[PDB]
Write a protein that binds this ligand. Structure first.
Ligand SMILES: Nc1nc2c(ncn2[C@@H]2O[C@H](COP(=O)(O)OP(=O)(O)OP(=O)(O)O)[C@@H](O)[C@H]2O)c(=O)[nH]1
Ligand SMILES: [Mg+2]
Lengths: 82, 846, 47, 56, 154
């Protein structure tokens, strides 16, 4: 296993915001994550490409379509990054 | 500030408190000396590189008192705040409270279970379930917390008993079955089945740093060989399941007659072989074993003695304690999820109110609600620090706060004060980390509010929060019966002791200090070592003077046996209104049903009466006419109406009963025999002449009048005394049991149960003893049985003293142990002489 | 509540008239432990 | 006696002269009423003598 | 040892004291602050150690791990999944240390030396000069045997 996956499991339970290949931004509390980037998230604010804001309460994202994730800022003092 | 070297940054612990899902509030408990503080030492060694155990001595990092070091037992419950990783690698914040396992300090556990959500019960694998374990299962179920069980001291199954593997599996299965039985006895929840397959039971050895569940050792297999689903592999390592080496499967039927179980074949026998190759074969075949398991050591590490080398090998093999973290996360709720039964159980005013719904979500901002239960002393002892948890809001240093005491109500507004928070700490065992804010869900140490706090307190905001009510006081597991009297040696130094007497009343939760009418200062306690610690802390830390202590005695109570021969009538001194009563005793077992809250007032007269007319076969005219019970909180003494409506108008009777119940509640305490409380009586009002004018219905006429009515009905119906009986469990070898029967023969006791411990050569003796005879009992056993037998005693019940306490024809010779008929008279006369009443009371006194 | 080379018998302790302390009920330790120096056959006879 | 000389802490017990040649069941038992009565007796006798004339 | 006259008060009234069992000196010594007036220079003793349940081996031909019947017999009587969801390990998966036997000849002696007195529980140390090793210290340190004469007790 590598370093960023341990950081991904470290950010579980917190509010992350992920952007996938379809240009959609999903912000909400990260419930579960695996070795691959399959992310189960809840209480999701959804931003499309045009700009519509939706409220989707349970989302499960496949790790293949993900461009990137945005993690909370207090993980710079996490032990695996020190 | 200066801090020791820690594997994680302190800013990570500062930022991790703001999330209420990643916190667990866990209380470790168990019986006396079953490995609590050593497991806490192992956790501190895991979290701190620079803190290590000595080669010959135990560390005891969370034993900071001098009494805890000199006695060798735990005295005060101590918190610690750590960050631990799980199996998968996620950091978690744990608030671990070490409670003492001795029975007399059970009050230190009740103050620990008020501010926590989960219980970790340590059980010795050699001794099994004992007295305090059985009491703490009950006290953890009745306080509505989740329960997990960790089995400590499995190396005693290896290095002391030298037991075969499947027999040790049978021993562990018997311990877990006994835990499941004690759960199913008290719990109404059928979903509390404990089993190691559910990740609910963890195995450990504290002396050599061993801790594993099924999942962690399956993770060890997955890290050694690879390509193994360890979470599926751990689902089949307990019970009657077998590995078949032909098909490589897990089947419930026997492949051969000599096929071992999977738990023996995969888990327990490699542990036996590791300990065997370290202990017995350190010189010949240890490097081959350490080269097979993948552990390398230094040549300087190979020259150590057997015990540090075994601890080092098990520490390098098993590594970090991830199974305990997995158990305490899976089976103990977060303070956000588990807040609702805590508010439903502990907050007065119900969860359905406005503030209960705000505290039910653990909101880190809004109404600041904190509940402080513990009071710690400084190094100087001149001031105290409060310790509690933050239910809602974020508490700040320098913020004005409102302290609310146990006597506060919304009607009175008397027990409240506005104070200023000096500093805020988070507590580690031997050092404290100073912060400036603490959010909701954490534990907090508050400086500067110690002045109005007596036992517990509630911290609120000064402005706003006008409907704030206090939380419940601590409901202890036992009742203190041991009376001791104190005096100063120099009578000019009396206000000094009265300082320390209200200081040890703050640090000790179940302590009760009072002043008698004769001027004697009486301290209540539960045992000998408890009051020994009381005297040590009192003198050496709060008095610095010499204090005389009297002979200890137990607290007596009053009762009746027969029905009174004559109706007891008395008038007020206004001579207009008369009350008449007959007193009778209660049925067998109803008093305990009051005491254990089965039968309750406040109910709307239907279910209450149906309980009486269903179980105890009360009539409808008797069940619908009960009014009140005990002095104060529902004591097992009962007010009953028998006035027929054909003679007494019940619409006029219903106005005076608000004064009658005050009369009864104030008359059922300090009874006429020796100014004590009543046991097991009902108080049946037969005739009542109620005054017509409202000025003749004053309470000042009728409340001492009803007090005298109570007293006359008590004195006519053959009054007797009652003494407390202790339950005693004796752990002794196979021959000392007869010596125990010899010793108990002289203290008016009787042995109820003698049971062999399965899987151990020791026996258990379960007996009852009078508490007035239990002074020096433990020293008698540990002297007559060469220190081999050990015994613990808790308060169990009350029974009637033999003899007549009113027989004036009995002459009492002083300084002599009197026989059985003289007991009640001796006790009654000597308690009247001690408290300061007359030398006798008559039948026609009231 | 209210010179002499020998040692005298008045210097003795444990002169206590207790039924528990005169017969102190020494241990035999699972029939396996032995008191050191006193003869092992004689200890097996006096068990 | 307690009008002019109160005793809030019962300090008149310490300082009471008592015969040590007798055993404790033989000498005077220091009950509080008896000690206060003895203090009252000695004070009432002491009030009758001017201290410039003689002193007890 | 050589040493390192109280009046009748309200506090030591024997009419207030219930005399039921006689209080002895070891009660004052075990609990130094409950029954003692003026407890100046006492020391707090150790409370209790858990019972070491080590059972000695008398026969070398028996195995080192054996159910010695001084131990009381255990009385005999869970979410077990079904055999149809067939979990299969890879072929190179083995239990740990299966080539090594359970017990050797030095196993029982190695366990018996773990509970030996000082220095027989050690395996390394420093030398001591021969006049600093008492050989009689345990013998008068333990207790007095029964049936001894008066002068031996003194
Ligand atoms: N054999 C063995 N002994 C242990 C183990 N864990 C603790 N002990 C010993 O048992 C004794 C008591 O341990 P403590 O941890 O002090 O017991 P405790 O549970 O703290 O007792 P309390 O003060 O009631 O909390 C010490 O001598 C420990 O070394 C273990 O895993 N194996
Ligand atoms: Mg402890």
């Amino acid at each position: 296993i590598g370093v960023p996956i341990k950081v991904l499991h470290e950010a579980e339970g917190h509010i992350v915001t992920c952007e996938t290949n379809t240009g959609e931004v999903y912000r909400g509390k990260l419930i579960e994550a695996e070795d691959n980037m399959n992310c189960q998230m809840s209480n999701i604010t959804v931003t499309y490409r045009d700009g519509r804001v939706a409220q989707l309460e349970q989302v499960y994202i496949r790790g293949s379509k993900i461009r990137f994730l945005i993690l909370p800022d207090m993980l710079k003092n996490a032990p695996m990054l020190k | 500030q200066t801090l020791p070297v820690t594997v994680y940054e302190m800013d990570f612990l500062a930022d991790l408190m703001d999330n209420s899902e990643l916190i667990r509030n866990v209380t470790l408990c168990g019986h006396l000396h079953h490995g609590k503080t050593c497991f806490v030492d192992c956790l501190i060694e895991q979290t701190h590189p620079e803190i290590r155990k000595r080669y010959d001595q135990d560390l005891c990092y969370t034993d900071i008192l001098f009494t805890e070091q000199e006695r060798g037992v735990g005295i005060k419950s101590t918190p610690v705040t750590v960050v631990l990783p799980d199996t998968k690698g996620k950091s978690y914040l744990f608030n671990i409270m070490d409670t003492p396992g001795h029975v007399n300090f059970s009050d230190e556990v009740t103050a620990g279970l008020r501010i926590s959500d989960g219980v970790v019960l340590f059980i010795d694998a050699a001794e099994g379930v004992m007295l305090n374990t059985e009491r703490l299962i009950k006290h953890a179920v009745q306080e509505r917390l989740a329960v997990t069980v960790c089995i400590n001291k499995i190396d005693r199954l290896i290095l002391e008993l030298k037991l075969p593997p499947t027999d040790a599996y049978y021993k562990l299965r018997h311990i877990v079955d006994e835990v499941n039985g004690l759960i199913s006895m008290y719990s109404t929840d059928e979903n509390l089945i404990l089993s190691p397959l559910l990740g609910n039971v963890c195995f450990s050895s504290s002396q050599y740093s061993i801790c594993f569940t099924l999942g962690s050792f399956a993770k060890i297999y997955a890290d050694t060989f690879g390509d193994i689903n360890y979470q599926e592999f751990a689902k089949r390592l307990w019970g009657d399941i077998y590995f078949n080496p032909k098909t490589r499967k897990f089947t419930k039927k026997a492949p051969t007659s000599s096929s071992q179980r999977s738990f023996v074949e995969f888990i327990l026998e490699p542990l036996y072989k590791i300990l065997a190759q370290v202990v017995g074969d350190v010189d010949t075949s240890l490097p081959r074993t350490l080269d097979e398991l993948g552990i390398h050591l230094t040549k300087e590490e190979l020259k150590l003695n057997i015990r540090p080398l075994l601890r080092l090998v098990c520490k390098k093999f098993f590594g970090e304690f991830t199974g305990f973290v997995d158990m305490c996360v899976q089976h103990i709720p977060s303070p956000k999820v588990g807040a609702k039964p805590k508010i439903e159980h502990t907050y007065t005013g119900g969860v359905d109110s406005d503030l209960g719904e705000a505290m039910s979500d653990c909101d880190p901002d809004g109404p600041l609600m904190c509940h402080t239960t513990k009071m710690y002393s400084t190094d100087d002892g001149v001031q105290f620090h409060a310790f509690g948890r933050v239910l809602s809001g974020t508490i700040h240093a320098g913020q004005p706060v409102k302290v609310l005491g146990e006597n506060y109500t919304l009607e009175d507004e008397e027990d409240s004060q506005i104070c200023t928070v000096g500093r805020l700490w988070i507590s580690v065992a031997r050092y404290h980390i100073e912060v400036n804010r603490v959010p909701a869900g954490n534990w907090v140490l508050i400086e500067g509010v110690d002045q109005p706090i007596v036992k517990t307190a509630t911290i609120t905001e000064p402005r706003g929060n006008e409907e704030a009510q206090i939380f419940r006081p601590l409901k202890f597991n036992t009742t203190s019966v041991i009376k001791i009297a104190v005096e100063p040696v120099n009578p000019s130094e009396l206000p000094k002791m009265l300082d320390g007497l209200r200081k040890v009343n703050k640090s000790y939760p179940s302590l009760t200090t009072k002043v008698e009418e004769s001027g004697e200062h009486v301290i209540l306690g539960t045992g000998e070592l408890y009051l020994d610690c009381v005297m040590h802390d009192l003198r050496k830390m709060y008095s610095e003077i010499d204090i005389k202590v009297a002979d200890p005695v137990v607290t007596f109570c009053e009762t009746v046996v027969e029905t009174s021969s004559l109706k007891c009538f008395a008038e007020t001194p206004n001579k207009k209104n008369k009350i008449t009563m007959i007193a009778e005793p209660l049925e067998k077992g109803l008093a305990e049903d009051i005491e254990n809250e089965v039968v309750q007032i406040t109910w709307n007269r239907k279910k209450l009466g149906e309980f009486f007319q269903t179980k105890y076969d009360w009539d409808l005219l008797a069940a619908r006419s009960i009014w009140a019970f005990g002095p104060d909180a529902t004591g097992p003494n009962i007010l009953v109406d028998d006035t027929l409506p054909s003679e007494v108008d019940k619409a006029l009777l219903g106005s005076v009963k608000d004064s009658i119940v005050q009369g009864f509640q104030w008359g059922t305490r300090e009874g006429p025999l020796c100014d004590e409380l009543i046991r097991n009586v009902k108080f049946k009002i037969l005739d009542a002449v109620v005054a017509q004018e409202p000025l003749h219905r004053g309470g000042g006429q009728i409340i001492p009048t009803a007090r005298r009515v109570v007293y006359s009905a008590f004195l006519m119906a053959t009054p007797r005394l009652m003494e407390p009986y202790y339950f005693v469990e004796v752990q002794a070898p196979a021959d000392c049991v007869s010596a125990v029967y010899t010793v108990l023969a002289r203290r008016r006791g009787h042995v109820t149960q003698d049971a062999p411990i399965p899987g151990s050569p020791l026996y258990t003796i379960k007996a009852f003893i009078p508490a007035i005879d239990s002074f020096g009992f433990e020293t008698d056993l540990r002297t007559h049985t060469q220190g081999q037998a050990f015994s613990l005693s808790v308060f169990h019940h009350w029974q009637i003293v033999p003899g007549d306490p009113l027989d004036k024809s009995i002459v009492i010779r002083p300084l002599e142990p009197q026989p059985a008929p003289h007991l009640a008279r001796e006790f009654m006369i000597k308690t009247r002489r001690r408290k300061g009443l007359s030398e006798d009371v008559s039948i026609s006194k009231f | 509540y209210l010179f002499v080379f020998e040692w005298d018998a008045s210097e003795d302790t444990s002169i206590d008239y207790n039924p528990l302390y005169k017969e102190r009920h020494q241990v035999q330790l699972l029939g396996r432990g032995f008191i050191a120096g006193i003869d092992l056959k004689q200890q097996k006879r006096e068990q | 006696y307690l009008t002019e000389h109160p005793d809030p802490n019962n300090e008149n017990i310490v300082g009471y002269n008592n015969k040590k040649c007798w055993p404790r069941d033989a000498r005077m038992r220091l009950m509080k009423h008896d000690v206060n009565l003895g203090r009252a007796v000695f004070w009432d006798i002491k009030n009758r003598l001017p201290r410039s004339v003689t002193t007890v | 040892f050589e040493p390192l006259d109280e009046d009748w008060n309200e506090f030591n009234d024997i009419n207030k004291i219930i005399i039921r069992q006689p209080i002895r000196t070891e009660y004052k010594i075990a609990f130094p602050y409950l029954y003692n007036n003026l407890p100046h220079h006492v020391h707090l003793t150790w409370y209790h150690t858990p019972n070491v349940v080590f059972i000695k081996t008398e026969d070398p031909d028996l195995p080192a791990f054996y159910f010695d019947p001084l131990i009381n017999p255990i009385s005999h009587r869970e979410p077990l999944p079904d055999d149809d969801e067939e979990f299969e390990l890879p072929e190179f998966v083995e239990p740990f240390l299966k080539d090594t036997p359970l017990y050797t000849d030095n196993t029982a002696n190695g366990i018996a030396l773990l509970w030996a007195p000082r220095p027989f529980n050690l395996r390394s140390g420093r030398t001591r000069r021969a006049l600093d090793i008492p050989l009689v210290k345990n013998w008068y340190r333990e207790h007095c045997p029964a049936g001894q004469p008066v002068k031996v007790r003194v």
